[PDB]
Design a protein around this ligand. Sequence first.
Ligand SMILES: O=C(O)C(=O)Nc1ccccc1
Length: 167
Amino acid sequence: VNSFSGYLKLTDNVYIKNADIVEEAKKVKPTVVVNAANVYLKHGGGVAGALNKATNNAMQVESDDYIATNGPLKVGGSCVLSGHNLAKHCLHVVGPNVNKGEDIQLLKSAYENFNQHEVLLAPLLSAGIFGADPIHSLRVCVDTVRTNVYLAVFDKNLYDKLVSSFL
Ligand SMILES: O=C(O)C(=O)Nc1ccccc1
């Protein structure tokens, strides 16, 4: 049994809810929240900007030190950093950004990072300002992630479209 409430069950392991991931993280304090990161961990907008704002910029300070030591992530890659006031840990995952011309086949690689964690609160990778089709992102998630994932979709129309169209 876990703390997650109000989710629709899509599969054995994937759950979905219309929710603000920031507000959901603050309520649940999950072991892992996933960030929709870029390779530079520059948390300017979208999910990343919202998560970072909720940490009062502490996520960005920590991220800048990580990049100064390790250099940029790979598209499709990830790193584990603090969850600050939102979660125990933040898994920063880089999905391909279609608005930069990145290979959408890298979306499966991105979701494979989730399999290193038994339970996660996450957004749909490469959705929103990353430019991918969220329907496609949900299909790759279901067909790639084997651990227990609680998805938060930001829009109410979008959520309803993802559920209605789910095979
Ligand atoms: O990825 C999401 O969770 C999301 O809601 N994307 C979105 C938001 C606003 C307009 C279109 C897509």
